[PDB]
Amino acid sequence: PQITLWKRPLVTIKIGGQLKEALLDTGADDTVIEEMSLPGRWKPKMIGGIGGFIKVRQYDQIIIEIAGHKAIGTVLVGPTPVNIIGRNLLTQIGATLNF
């Protein structure tokens, strides 16, 4: 698809068999999701945004569907205000910015 930017680029994702809404975010290096349970072990990570830093849980090799495209990769879980799909998974679904 071709998504214009007059509205937020929100899409449906599926993770852990649950549908959620998430933002397609070219300004995010990493994918960050609100608190939820994921399988496996996690590692610590610190991420920085506009207001300062937060601690998140890094889960690797998680299956996640994004706007109907399958991805398998790293998902950060933490107190993000919105679910964000960052460049690590935008590249897996083949997304580009065009103008």
The site for ligand 5B7 (CB under 6 A) is made up of 23, 25, 27-30, 32, 47-50, 81-82, 84, 86
Query: Nearer to a second copy by C-beta: 59 or 83?
Result: 83
**Two structure tokens written together for 6:** 């007059």
Q: How far from 10 is each of 13, 82, 83, 92, CA to CA, in Å?
A: 9, 10, 9, 17
Q: Are 73 and 62 in contact (CB under 8 A)?
A: yes
Q: How far is the CB of 30 from a second copy (least distance, A)?
A: 10
Contact pattern for Cl ion over residues 58 through 87, marking x by CB under 5 A: ---------------xx-------------
Binding of residue 2 to a second copy (CB under 8 A): yes
What does DSSP assign to residue 48?
E
What does DSSP assign to residue 83?
-
* Interacting residue ranges for Cl ion, rule: CB under 5 A: 4, 73-74, 88
